[PDB]
């Protein structure tokens, strides 16, 4: 194959995080996405691949939990400062940065690195809003807290944490739109409602349909002017039947077809500047088929974000072979 | 804050498949009361009723299965429902087969003259004791309750206490997909409005609820009796049911129904029936059906996807 | 009353995967006849056609597997289909792989030259013998039957009898999600209209059927040939198939197609293909795929979710 509808410059990062939460086995995530055949698929889409590989992470020996709840603040904060540089390296070069997880904590870095493109906009695709402040959280796991640090208006409600001094608020209220919300905690709900954070919960997808959801997502974000899109995609935004290998599985999720639609609609704006793919936990499966379904689903999302569709036509066919 | 009464009705005589009596227990074991408390509901556990059995009650006119048992059990239940509604509680009834709606709707009618029904099921349950092919009374409750059908319903043993209390314009169905030919005649002929799986596929559950509430409470506010059969949902979601019919409601559709019922602020009585744990192939499949039932009752009393039930007022500053 | 002809076509040579030849028997064990009977249909069962085996059958241009065996069996089937259409029967063909659609559409077009096709499949099966990557004829049937592709289609051993019977404006695809780059080229350059899963996600199955019928029967009523591949549905619903592809039609959507095909009253021939009971992990996986196929044919001939197929005009009185 030598002809394609569009050629994309794709930078792939493997971030094996496991300290952002407490459930072990989410570190094997970027490795399972590769075993499924991610790079082979991106190559068949006519992409200029620039693999940064699986990054090695070292935990800080003396790392006390802040305010006796926030587990591993130094180990996550430092790892995110460095991942932000790898993302800023690729984006400045002209590459679209794909980050394989791991847990949703790595989103602090990817979005901050992307920002270094100031007029960016995020599309959060999760079952959870991940907008908990270090005070309002109940679990202590930082994977449910990344959006708080990135928002400009939440600066006064978020305290200075150890190894979090490097973060500067980059994205405003109108610059983030959520999709697939079904497990929102009481303080998380207050933040969205009061700070005018426009969102599309599972209920809003039921009422309007994935087509209207995406249309409205782009009318709010890239409506005023053309803006680079950051797509933070969490595997648990899909129904547990489709994505059983995840730490926080919430029933009544997005269908395979809904996720693919989201991914395709992102690809059709031609503004996807970075993508996150998180919560793939191969240790959270009851069978090999369940482990492989989640991995293939993850690949499908990334591929659909860079051309892959149901109609096909990503690969351009020259002429019909005459007999 | 809503005053909610919970009644468990371990009754199986409305059909032949054994195990539906263990339904109220399995919904309770799925933490029903605990979930209802966590939403801020003033609870009143009425317990798991022990019905008076009939020793001599067999096949009537070589068709109707166990009528004296069905009628008496429904009579006793209508008194308990009557007690619950009269005090000021929103009556939750756990089944058990759908023949129990004779009791719950009759008892609710004793205090609510202008009551309207939302019947969420795969079936119409409107067969008369004359149109039924099975003889199973769980597929006949609406015939006894509907006024326009009075002249078409024969006097059954143990059914002499019932008096039709609902009109054809006062009952809307959602999720029909296994309708008998006489049931289809009753629906069409008497103008009983319904939204079948097909109407859901066409219009969508948003328009379905918008249209349902226009039909029932469009002109005036009325107490809502929500009769929800667990078989309304697809057998992949609710496998522990007696009559599984493929092509059912998705989890998202069921919650949306329950959410929009709560959003009227007029829910007065709810039924959650046909949860049969003995019929699921595995223990986890029995738990899936039970937890799904709990989610319906919960969504009907405030639980949502947006997470706006537990009220938050102030954010802590550093 | 519909006169329905049921033809067992145990085709296997169209693909390399073994077991799809047991598909017609699998659909019958799932009570296809009993279901078509109680629908009020006039039945004729031709049994499973015993095709002439070709022992000396070598691969054409070292790629196309079993062309003589496929070509001959399809010519044998085209005669049986032709015979049934002549007797005023709606020709139902139980497969077998989708290569048998060559014989079914061919035999149908002899008596119905103004027929229009509704292709409900995950794939387009429009690969020419010069574009195919697998050399499997089951993914090549439309190529031989398309009029505008004649100059691009070479003459295969035992494929002469085939005269391109349908034009590009007469075939409409529904359920597309695994389209090959040469297949995609044909569909865009020859102007073949289709509705992929993305088109269904955007418009909804109601608008799909309305638009399908606008393209095919918008100017006049024509005989409808419904070529239904079981892999058009999601693999969770239809597990026992040779080429499963994720993100398929929901059970509700597949029945909607069928119910709409019936509402026109124009269905002249129907193929139900790719039901492979060997490729199922468990006994219930095969039976689920078979029963699903039985729901498809039955829905295409009257079976509804509302129940209005059997006539009911008067209620029994006590
Ligand atoms: N990936 C297999 C495809 C064939 C499916 C045919 B079927 O199952 O739809 O009949 C493919 N396009 C091919 O040419 O071999
Ligand atoms: Mn997350
Ligand atoms: Mn999540
Ligand atoms: Mn019922
Ligand atoms: Mn039912
Ligand atoms: Mn096919
Ligand atoms: Mn196919």
Tab-separated table of C-alpha atoms in Angstrom, chain A:
chain	number	residue	atom	x	y	z
A	1	UNK	CA	0.000	0.000	0.000
A	2	UNK	CA	1.430	3.407	-1.117
A	3	UNK	CA	-1.594	5.797	-1.179
A	4	UNK	CA	-3.635	7.169	1.808
A	5	UNK	CA	-6.364	9.842	2.379
A	6	UNK	CA	-4.036	11.683	4.817
A	7	UNK	CA	-0.532	11.090	6.266
A	8	UNK	CA	-0.096	11.773	10.014
A	9	UNK	CA	3.054	12.272	12.149
A	10	UNK	CA	2.433	10.042	15.223
A	11	UNK	CA	4.664	9.954	18.353
A	12	UNK	CA	3.978	6.927	20.639
A	13	UNK	CA	4.878	6.997	24.416
A	14	UNK	CA	4.535	4.028	26.785
A	15	UNK	CA	3.940	5.318	30.357
A	16	UNK	CA	3.677	2.358	32.824
A	17	UNK	CA	2.175	4.251	35.815
A	18	UNK	CA	0.931	2.350	38.936
A	19	UNK	CA	1.385	4.881	41.815
A	20	UNK	CA	-1.493	7.236	40.787
A	21	UNK	CA	-3.904	4.624	42.245
A	22	UNK	CA	-3.553	1.453	44.459
A	23	UNK	CA	-4.807	-1.466	42.255
A	24	UNK	CA	-1.691	-3.287	40.924
A	25	UNK	CA	-1.492	-4.489	37.302
A	26	UNK	CA	-2.159	-1.208	35.404
A	27	UNK	CA	1.651	-0.902	34.710
A	28	UNK	CA	1.427	-3.830	32.187
A	29	UNK	CA	-0.984	-1.587	30.172
A	30	UNK	CA	1.301	-0.059	27.452
A	31	UNK	CA	2.804	-3.579	26.916
A	32	UNK	CA	-0.627	-5.218	26.271
A	33	UNK	CA	-1.600	-2.463	23.729
A	34	UNK	CA	1.662	-3.275	21.816
A	35	UNK	CA	1.095	-7.117	22.043
A	36	UNK	CA	-2.309	-6.543	20.333
A	37	UNK	CA	-0.495	-4.933	17.353
A	38	UNK	CA	-0.747	-1.128	17.797
A	39	UNK	CA	2.354	-0.053	15.776
A	40	UNK	CA	1.528	-2.478	12.889
A	41	UNK	CA	-1.974	-0.843	12.688
A	42	UNK	CA	-0.661	2.788	12.780
A	43	UNK	CA	1.878	1.882	10.021
A	44	UNK	CA	-0.932	0.405	7.806
A	45	UNK	CA	-2.680	3.831	8.190
A	46	UNK	CA	0.311	5.606	6.550
A	47	UNK	CA	1.714	7.305	9.660
A	48	UNK	CA	5.228	8.671	10.216
A	49	UNK	CA	5.769	6.670	13.445
A	50	UNK	CA	8.215	8.016	16.093
A	51	UNK	CA	8.199	5.521	19.011
A	52	UNK	CA	9.596	6.891	22.327
A	53	UNK	CA	9.096	3.372	23.805
A	54	UNK	CA	8.227	2.271	27.352
A	55	UNK	CA	9.713	4.878	29.770
A	56	UNK	CA	11.429	3.630	32.961
A	57	UNK	CA	10.006	5.051	36.232
A	58	UNK	CA	11.771	5.185	39.639
A	59	UNK	CA	9.772	5.780	42.892
A	60	UNK	CA	11.093	8.385	45.415
A	61	UNK	CA	12.264	6.470	48.596
A	62	UNK	CA	11.165	9.173	51.115
A	63	UNK	CA	7.614	10.024	49.945
A	64	UNK	CA	5.159	10.831	52.795
A	65	UNK	CA	1.439	11.127	51.888
A	66	UNK	CA	0.243	14.804	51.964
A	67	UNK	CA	-2.567	15.705	54.480
A	68	UNK	CA	-2.695	11.920	55.355
A	69	UNK	CA	-4.727	10.879	52.237
A	70	UNK	CA	-2.892	11.813	48.947
A	71	UNK	CA	-0.882	8.581	48.332
A	72	UNK	CA	2.539	9.082	46.534
A	73	UNK	CA	2.475	12.888	45.685
A	74	UNK	CA	6.253	13.153	44.928
A	75	UNK	CA	6.492	9.896	42.826
A	76	UNK	CA	3.601	11.021	40.540
A	77	UNK	CA	4.364	14.793	40.398
A	78	UNK	CA	8.005	14.276	39.275
A	79	UNK	CA	7.100	11.500	36.731
A	80	UNK	CA	4.469	13.884	35.219
A	81	UNK	CA	6.970	16.854	34.996
A	82	UNK	CA	9.280	14.674	32.879
A	83	UNK	CA	6.486	13.126	30.719
A	84	UNK	CA	5.344	16.747	30.006
A	85	UNK	CA	8.787	17.437	28.431
A	86	UNK	CA	8.609	14.294	26.162
A	87	UNK	CA	5.122	15.494	24.983
A	88	UNK	CA	6.323	19.138	24.466
A	89	UNK	CA	9.330	17.735	22.478
A	90	UNK	CA	7.049	15.859	20.002
A	91	UNK	CA	4.309	18.584	19.674
A	92	UNK	CA	6.913	21.345	18.896
A	93	UNK	CA	8.501	19.036	16.216
A	94	UNK	CA	5.053	18.665	14.548
A	95	UNK	CA	4.014	15.227	15.914
A	96	UNK	CA	0.673	14.032	17.407
A	97	UNK	CA	1.537	12.498	20.784
A	98	UNK	CA	-0.120	9.204	21.779
A	99	UNK	CA	0.437	8.240	25.447
A	100	UNK	CA	-0.258	4.633	26.583
A	101	UNK	CA	-1.224	4.017	30.232
A	102	UNK	CA	-1.119	3.208	33.043
A	103	UNK	CA	-3.550	5.311	35.121
A	104	UNK	CA	-5.257	8.680	34.333
A	105	UNK	CA	-2.639	10.629	36.466
A	106	UNK	CA	-0.265	10.992	33.424
A	107	UNK	CA	-2.868	13.473	31.977
A	108	UNK	CA	-1.372	16.312	34.139
A	109	UNK	CA	1.873	16.084	32.114
A	110	UNK	CA	0.512	15.458	28.551
A	111	UNK	CA	-1.891	18.448	28.767
A	112	UNK	CA	0.755	20.758	30.365
A	113	UNK	CA	3.328	19.757	27.697
A	114	UNK	CA	0.726	20.334	24.925
A	115	UNK	CA	0.012	23.806	26.460
A	116	UNK	CA	3.699	24.865	26.068
A	117	UNK	CA	-0.143	25.419	21.721
A	118	UNK	CA	-1.677	27.830	24.315
A	119	UNK	CA	-5.201	27.898	22.741
A	120	UNK	CA	-5.646	24.084	23.104
A	121	UNK	CA	-8.941	22.325	24.102
A	122	UNK	CA	-9.518	18.997	25.915
A	123	UNK	CA	-12.156	16.262	25.295
A	124	UNK	CA	-12.341	14.067	28.425
A	125	UNK	CA	-13.787	10.632	27.728
A	126	UNK	CA	-14.226	8.848	31.083
A	127	UNK	CA	-16.925	7.257	33.306
A	128	UNK	CA	-15.460	9.554	36.062
A	129	UNK	CA	-14.874	13.331	36.002
A	130	UNK	CA	-11.338	13.026	37.579
A	131	UNK	CA	-11.863	16.689	38.786
A	132	UNK	CA	-11.462	15.965	42.591
A	133	UNK	CA	-9.315	18.555	44.498
A	134	UNK	CA	-6.722	17.192	47.074
A	135	UNK	CA	-9.246	18.168	49.814
A	136	UNK	CA	-12.580	17.036	48.189
A	137	UNK	CA	-11.173	13.529	47.333
A	138	UNK	CA	-12.105	10.503	49.527
A	139	UNK	CA	-9.826	7.715	48.161
A	140	UNK	CA	-6.525	9.638	48.066
A	141	UNK	CA	-5.639	8.193	44.607
A	142	UNK	CA	-4.333	10.985	42.289
A	143	UNK	CA	-5.821	9.247	39.161
A	144	UNK	CA	-9.222	10.706	40.157
A	145	UNK	CA	-7.697	14.201	40.675
A	146	UNK	CA	-5.811	15.342	37.427
A	147	UNK	CA	-8.316	17.944	36.035
A	148	UNK	CA	-8.167	20.056	39.288
A	149	UNK	CA	-4.451	20.942	38.808
A	150	UNK	CA	-4.931	21.874	35.096
A	151	UNK	CA	-7.947	24.216	35.502
A	152	UNK	CA	-7.340	28.002	35.898
A	153	UNK	CA	-10.416	28.653	38.093
A	154	UNK	CA	-9.547	25.758	40.492
A	155	UNK	CA	-6.135	27.367	41.405
A	156	UNK	CA	-7.561	28.961	44.638
A	157	UNK	CA	-9.219	25.634	45.714
A	158	UNK	CA	-6.082	23.486	45.085
A	159	UNK	CA	-3.073	23.674	47.493
A	160	UNK	CA	0.661	23.401	46.601
A	161	UNK	CA	1.642	19.693	46.760
A	162	UNK	CA	5.176	18.097	46.941
A	163	UNK	CA	6.612	17.810	43.419
A	164	UNK	CA	3.656	19.786	41.943
A	165	UNK	CA	5.322	23.284	41.927
A	166	UNK	CA	6.118	23.015	38.140
A	167	UNK	CA	2.391	22.952	37.057
A	168	UNK	CA	0.920	26.234	35.772
A	169	UNK	CA	-2.884	26.459	35.097
A	170	UNK	CA	-3.249	26.343	31.278
A	171	UNK	CA	-6.847	25.313	30.356
A	172	UNK	CA	-9.904	27.449	31.286
A	173	UNK	CA	-13.566	26.341	31.983
A	174	UNK	CA	-14.857	26.713	28.350
A	175	UNK	CA	-11.762	24.792	27.016
A	176	UNK	CA	-12.794	21.399	28.494
A	177	UNK	CA	-15.835	19.234	27.499
A	178	UNK	CA	-16.486	15.831	29.096
A	179	UNK	CA	-18.190	12.770	27.448
A	180	UNK	CA	-19.525	9.544	29.026
A	181	UNK	CA	-20.072	10.675	32.657
A	182	UNK	CA	-21.978	8.223	34.868
A	183	UNK	CA	-19.995	7.900	38.165
A	184	UNK	CA	-19.687	11.526	39.427
A	185	UNK	CA	-18.888	12.070	43.164
A	186	UNK	CA	-20.831	14.816	45.097
A	187	UNK	CA	-17.916	17.406	45.215
A	188	UNK	CA	-17.056	16.689	41.507
A	189	UNK	CA	-20.712	17.543	40.602
A	190	UNK	CA	-20.451	20.916	42.454
A	191	UNK	CA	-17.295	21.907	40.464
A	192	UNK	CA	-18.849	21.201	37.006
A	193	UNK	CA	-22.190	22.937	37.840
A	194	UNK	CA	-20.775	26.129	39.455
A	195	UNK	CA	-17.645	26.671	37.254
A	196	UNK	CA	-19.784	26.418	33.992
A	197	UNK	CA	-17.964	23.202	32.823
A	198	UNK	CA	-20.097	21.976	29.837
A	199	UNK	CA	-20.497	18.149	29.881
A	200	UNK	CA	-22.233	15.191	28.133
A	201	UNK	CA	-23.137	12.470	30.660
A	202	UNK	CA	-24.393	8.978	29.644
A	203	UNK	CA	-27.911	10.460	30.198
A	204	UNK	CA	-27.144	13.331	27.740
A	205	UNK	CA	-25.955	10.698	25.172
A	206	UNK	CA	-29.297	8.833	25.673
A	207	UNK	CA	-31.305	12.034	25.034
A	208	UNK	CA	-29.249	13.554	22.169
A	209	UNK	CA	-27.303	10.683	20.555
A	210	UNK	CA	-23.540	10.423	19.958
A	211	UNK	CA	-23.896	12.505	16.700
A	212	UNK	CA	-25.452	15.572	18.479
A	213	UNK	CA	-23.016	15.141	21.466
A	214	UNK	CA	-19.903	15.402	19.181
A	215	UNK	CA	-21.476	18.205	17.090
A	216	UNK	CA	-22.119	20.222	20.305
A	217	UNK	CA	-18.647	19.312	21.724
A	218	UNK	CA	-17.103	20.979	18.594
A	219	UNK	CA	-19.553	23.946	18.649
A	220	UNK	CA	-18.440	24.773	22.243
A	221	UNK	CA	-14.671	24.136	21.768
A	222	UNK	CA	-13.506	24.647	18.103
A	223	UNK	CA	-16.630	26.772	17.353
A	224	UNK	CA	-15.057	30.257	17.762
A	225	UNK	CA	-11.760	29.344	15.939
A	226	UNK	CA	-9.511	26.352	14.907
A	227	UNK	CA	-7.832	24.861	18.016
A	228	UNK	CA	-5.481	21.865	18.637
A	229	UNK	CA	-7.470	19.051	20.298
A	230	UNK	CA	-6.172	16.953	23.230
A	231	UNK	CA	-8.123	13.701	23.623
A	232	UNK	CA	-7.906	12.204	27.073
A	233	UNK	CA	-9.535	8.821	26.591
A	234	UNK	CA	-10.184	6.419	29.467
A	235	UNK	CA	-10.932	2.764	28.594
A	236	UNK	CA	-13.573	2.625	31.439
A	237	UNK	CA	-15.792	5.173	29.469
A	238	UNK	CA	-16.809	1.982	27.559
A	239	UNK	CA	-19.178	-0.566	29.087
A	240	UNK	CA	-17.444	-3.238	31.297
A	241	UNK	CA	-18.642	-5.915	28.783
A	242	UNK	CA	-16.344	-4.292	26.143
A	243	UNK	CA	-13.555	-3.068	28.553
A	244	UNK	CA	-13.351	-5.577	31.524
A	245	UNK	CA	-9.624	-4.833	32.172
A	246	UNK	CA	-9.921	-1.534	34.158
A	247	UNK	CA	-9.627	-0.397	37.819
A	248	UNK	CA	-12.941	1.516	38.035
A	249	UNK	CA	-15.577	-0.347	35.850
A	250	UNK	CA	-18.974	1.470	35.734
A	251	UNK	CA	-22.058	-0.293	34.217
A	252	UNK	CA	-24.069	1.492	31.468
A	253	UNK	CA	-21.113	2.692	29.408
A	254	UNK	CA	-20.396	3.688	25.780
A	255	UNK	CA	-20.883	1.034	23.094
A	256	UNK	CA	-17.990	-0.053	20.836
A	257	UNK	CA	-19.757	1.978	18.101
A	258	UNK	CA	-20.034	5.114	20.258
A	259	UNK	CA	-16.322	5.179	21.129
A	260	UNK	CA	-15.366	4.564	17.452
A	261	UNK	CA	-17.717	7.420	16.475
A	262	UNK	CA	-16.048	9.762	19.063
A	263	UNK	CA	-12.582	8.735	17.749
A	264	UNK	CA	-13.640	9.233	14.054
A	265	UNK	CA	-15.296	12.624	14.758
A	266	UNK	CA	-12.030	13.745	16.391
A	267	UNK	CA	-10.090	12.527	13.264
A	268	UNK	CA	-12.486	14.407	10.914
A	269	UNK	CA	-11.772	17.867	12.516
A	270	UNK	CA	-8.089	17.244	11.697
A	271	UNK	CA	-7.019	19.043	14.897
A	272	UNK	CA	-6.056	16.075	17.172
A	273	UNK	CA	-2.629	17.248	18.454
A	274	UNK	CA	-2.327	14.661	21.322
A	275	UNK	CA	-4.088	11.569	22.662
A	276	UNK	CA	-4.106	9.754	26.017
A	277	UNK	CA	-5.192	6.103	26.356
A	278	UNK	CA	-5.459	5.027	30.026
A	279	UNK	CA	-6.653	2.400	32.606
A	280	UNK	CA	-5.782	-0.747	30.594
A	281	UNK	CA	-5.241	-3.297	33.420
A	282	UNK	CA	-4.459	-6.808	32.002
A	283	UNK	CA	-4.241	-8.195	35.582
A	284	UNK	CA	-7.993	-7.370	35.966
A	285	UNK	CA	-9.359	-10.094	33.603
A	286	UNK	CA	-11.103	-13.467	34.218
A	287	UNK	CA	-10.053	-14.926	30.773
A	288	UNK	CA	-7.531	-14.311	27.900
A	289	UNK	CA	-10.375	-13.271	25.547
A	290	UNK	CA	-11.412	-10.511	28.051
A	291	UNK	CA	-7.748	-9.380	28.273
A	292	UNK	CA	-7.469	-9.302	24.430
A	293	UNK	CA	-10.876	-7.549	23.844
A	294	UNK	CA	-9.748	-4.512	25.972
A	295	UNK	CA	-6.321	-4.401	24.245
A	296	UNK	CA	-7.860	-4.583	20.710
A	297	UNK	CA	-10.494	-1.944	21.777
A	298	UNK	CA	-7.657	0.391	22.928
A	299	UNK	CA	-5.845	-0.062	19.536
A	300	UNK	CA	-9.175	0.524	17.672
A	301	UNK	CA	-9.651	3.912	19.468
A	302	UNK	CA	-6.099	5.157	18.601
A	303	UNK	CA	-6.379	3.834	15.000
A	304	UNK	CA	-9.844	5.444	14.541
A	305	UNK	CA	-8.330	8.712	15.822
A	306	UNK	CA	-5.783	8.519	12.944
A	307	UNK	CA	-7.950	7.442	9.976
A	308	UNK	CA	-9.388	3.934	10.642
A	309	UNK	CA	-13.158	3.793	9.982
A	310	UNK	CA	-16.041	1.296	9.464
A	311	UNK	CA	-16.527	2.414	5.804
A	312	UNK	CA	-12.778	2.045	5.137
A	313	UNK	CA	-11.262	4.354	2.530
A	314	UNK	CA	-8.258	5.314	4.704
A	315	UNK	CA	-6.065	3.379	2.181
A	316	UNK	CA	-6.550	4.887	-1.338
A	317	UNK	CA	-6.925	2.228	-4.108
A	318	UNK	CA	-5.160	3.185	-7.397
A	319	UNK	CA	-7.289	1.410	-10.130
A	320	UNK	CA	-9.111	-1.931	-10.622
A	321	UNK	CA	-6.875	-4.710	-12.056
A	322	UNK	CA	-8.233	-5.386	-15.590
A	323	UNK	CA	-8.004	-9.044	-16.866
